[PDB]
Design a protein around this ligand. Structure first.
Ligand SMILES: */C1=C/C(=O)[C@@H](O)[C@@H](O)C[C@H]2O[C@@H]2c2cc(OC)cc(O)c2C(=O)O[C@@H](C)C1
Length: 336
């Protein structure tokens, strides 16, 4: 049929295996289409990426592929297949094939009230995938509703691991310690994000929607109030600590005034996730065992990674041509 299929001007060269192309999205260098996998007789999502001229875009691509080839968990989108040219010279583009999901949490939150069972079930599933990621000693680092994919039966998968890193322990879902001291290197960063997502499910409305960089921190303290003395001591960067002190006092807005209609158990969980001090922040295993998730919590049915990562390339500084090379090698699993 014709030649290489074309979607909105962009070449989508996915051989005869995948046909019936239909546009879904365009997150910069990466267009997402749905397709029909003629081998497996299913419909799939296919992401086209062209990272090879940007070290950063190569690092995200390598990281995502490396991680996701190694992960196997129901609440994490897996990689079915990767398509690419037989020679690194001709490898200009990379197509990642994954399960077609039906919607995402962001989309879903702009159209629907979530019943408490649903919020509970989505939360559960987020935390279940998170437990597996963290057992692998990996930080997602970019949890937000658009990275939470949903099917018609409410199965939830975590997506986009391009910012993931081996733990070294949008702006709206960023832990405050990332704004404050180092480049945020604890698992509690992900828990924070999940608190933001929880709050968003409770009200259909982002909890800390900072319009600019320092505003994000004002939204956070607007709600949690000024950090306590002990909490100030965890900000160990000179300029951040002093900045915190230069801020006018702020009251802690109680959770039931922001969410008058929420399950009080959900709000208790929310509190522990949206804890300023990262050391006092609830961890994933305790989050799952919280009373709020009582009906889904099943630790015999919450797999962990068999072995934790410890990255065989981290601190990169690798040139693009080198990253491309590893991307070529890691994508080789899938070549004829
Ligand atoms: C999953 C990570 C992302 O890129 C997200 O930002 C995601 O929101 C993008 C979104 O296009 C995907 C998408 C959309 C639908 O229909 C709503 C179904 C899908 O299966 C996917 C998908 O699989 O996204 C993957 C490729 C990336």
């Amino acid at each position: 049929a014709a030649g290489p299929e074309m979607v909105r001007g962009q070449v989508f060269d996915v051989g005869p295996r995948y046909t019936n192309l239909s546009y879904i999205g365009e997150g910069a260098y990466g267009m997402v289409c749905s397709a029909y996998d003629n081998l497996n007789k299913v419909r799939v999502a296919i992401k086209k990426i062209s990272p090879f001229e940007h070290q950063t875009y190569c690092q995200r691509t390598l990281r995502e592929i490396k991680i996701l080839l190694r992960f196997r968990h129901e609440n994490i989108i897996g990689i079915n297949d990767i398509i690419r040219a037989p020679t690194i010279e001709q490898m200009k583009d990379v197509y990642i094939v994954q399960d077609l999901m039906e919607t995402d949490l962001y989309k879903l939150l702009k159209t629907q009230h979530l019943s408490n069972d649903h919020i509970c079930y989505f939360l559960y599933q987020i935390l279940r995938g998170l437990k597996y990621i963290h057992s692998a000693n990996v930080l997602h680092r970019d949890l937000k509703p658009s990275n939470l994919l949903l099917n018609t039966t409410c199965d939830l998968k975590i997506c986009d691991f391009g910012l993931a890193r081996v733990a070294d322990p949008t702006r709206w879902y960023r832990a405050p310690e990332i704004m404050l001291n180092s480049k945020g290197y604890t698992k509690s960063i992900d828990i924070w994000s999940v608190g933001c997502i929880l709050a968003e499910m409770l009200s259909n409305r982002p909890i800390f929607p900072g319009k600019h960089y320092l505003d994000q921190l004002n939204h956070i303290l607007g709600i949690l109030g000024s950090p306590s003395q002990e909490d100030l001591n965890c900000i160990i960067n000179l300029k951040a600590r002093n900045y915190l002190l230069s801020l006018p006092h702020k009251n802690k807005v109680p959770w039931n005034r922001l969410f008058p209609n929420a399950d009080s158990k959900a709000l208790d969980l929310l509190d522990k996730m949206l804890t300023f001090n990262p050391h006092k922040r609830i961890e994933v295993e305790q989050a799952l065992a919280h009373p709020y998730l009582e009906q889904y919590y099943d630790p015999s049915d919450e797999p962990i990674a068999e072995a934790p990562f410890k990255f065989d390339m981290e601190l990169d500084d690798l040139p693009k041509e080198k990253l491309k090379e590893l991307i070529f090698e890691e994508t080789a699993r899938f070549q004829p």
